[PDB]
Amino acid sequence: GGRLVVFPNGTRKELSADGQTVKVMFFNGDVKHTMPDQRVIYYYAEAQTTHITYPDGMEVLQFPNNQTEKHFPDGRKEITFPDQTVKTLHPDGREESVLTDGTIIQLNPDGSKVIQFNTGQREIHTADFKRREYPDGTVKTVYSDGRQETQYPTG
C-alpha cells in the first residue's frame, strides 16, 4: 500500500504502492513530486513558486502573483502576465505580444515593428518610415526625411 520514510534531517518521502510516484516533503517546507512519466513538480515554500520539468525539455514556472512562464525546448519563452497578456520571446530576439483586448505587437530584433490594434488599424515602423493603415483603406505615412503622405481610398 506504499511507504512513508522519515529521515533524521526531517525530510519525508512517500512512495506509491507501485513505486511510480514519489513525493518528497523537505524539512524546509518544499515539496517535490516525481510522476510515473518522469515529470518533476517542485514547490518552493518560501517563494511560493512552482517549477515543473517535463521529459520533453519543457519547463514551466508559476509565480504567486499568478504569472506563468513557459520555456520550450527550442529556446522560446512564453509569459502569461496576471492581466493575461501573452508575450512570446524568440531566441532570435523577435517578441510578440497578444493583449487580451486584441492588440498584437510584433517586435523585430532590428527594431522594426508591426502593431495590430484591436480597432482594426495597423501600424508599421521601419528604418525609413512609420505607417498607419486604416480600415477604410486610407494609408498615412511619415518618412525619416520628415515628409508626410496620405494615400486616399480608391473609393
Binding site: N9, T11, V24, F26, F27, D30, K32, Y44, A47, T49
Partner: peptide, 12 residues
C-alpha cells in the same frame, strides 16, 4: 537523507 533545491530568492 535528502536536501531541497537552493532558494531562488535571497534570504531577508
Amino acid at each position: 537523507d535528502l536536501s531541497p533545491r537552493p532558494s531562488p530568492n535571497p534570504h531577508p
